Amino acid sequence: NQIDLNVTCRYAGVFHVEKNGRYSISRTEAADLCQAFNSTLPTMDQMKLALSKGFETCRYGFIEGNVVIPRIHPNAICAANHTGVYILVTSNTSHYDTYCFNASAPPEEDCTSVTDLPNSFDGPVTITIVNRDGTRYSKKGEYRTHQEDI
């Protein structure tokens, strides 16, 4: 009973989280996930600022209202070579990664590791934060509040 959460650098408080390195988070689970990080789903304005500071990924994730990929550099296999905050328009499916926003984070690029999940609640799951440099932090707990997400 284990979940890996792959997390990125923060840019103006905004970061990306993948569950088990595969698209697998529902919109309701994304909100609970960010809450476990004492974070919220970013607004488009927050995300655009993060992008201006250096934030980009090659993965779809939720923000408040939309599913997006922030892109700085054109890449043919990432958001169809677009730049800016690319908005997913047409999809059959409901499960993606998530973006999260922590207001307490540094204002620009913070590429330090994440070493806590400060607002997870009591639970039976071994939750492991996995940073891009491989550093890991684990704790027993839960963050999902909706039964349909478990």
Ligand X SMILES: Nc1cccc2c1CCN(CCCOC1CCOCC1)C2
- The verdict on whether residue 59 carries a ligand-binding annotation is yes
Instruction: Tell me: is residue 132 an annotated ligand-binding position.
Output: no
Contacts of 65 (CB under 8 A, 6+ apart): 43, 44
Q: Which is nearer to ligand X, 6 or 120 (CB)?
A: 6
Kindly tell me which of 23 and 145 has the beta carbon lying closer to ligand X.
23
In 3-state terms, what secondary structure has residue 12?
coil
**CB closer to ligand X out of 6 and 40:** 6
CB of 78 to ligand X, least distance (A): 7
CB-closest chain residue to ligand X: 6
Query: Which of 117, 140, 145, 126 is closest to 27 using CA atoms?
Result: 145
- Considering the complex, state which of residue 57 and residue 148 has its C-beta at the smaller distance from ligand X: 57
Asked if residue 110 lies in contact with residue 7, where contact means CB atoms within 8 angstroms, the answer is no
Residues forming the site for ligand X (CB under 6 A): 6-8, 18, 21, 58-59, 130-132
Instruction: Give φ, ψ of 36 to 5 degrees.
Output: -70, -30
Query: Do 33 and 3 meet the contact criterion of CB atoms below 8 Å apart?
Result: no
Among 6, 116, 105, 109, residue whose Cα is nearest residue 61 = 6
Residue 137 annotated as binding site: no
Q: 11 among the known binding-site residues?
A: no
Write down the least CB distance from residue 37 to ligand X, Å. Answer: 14
Q: How many CA atoms lie within 13 A of 88 on its CB side?
A: 20
> CB of 122: closest distance to ligand X in angstroms?
26
Binding residues: 22, 59-60, 86
Binding residues for hyaluronan: 22, 59-60, 86
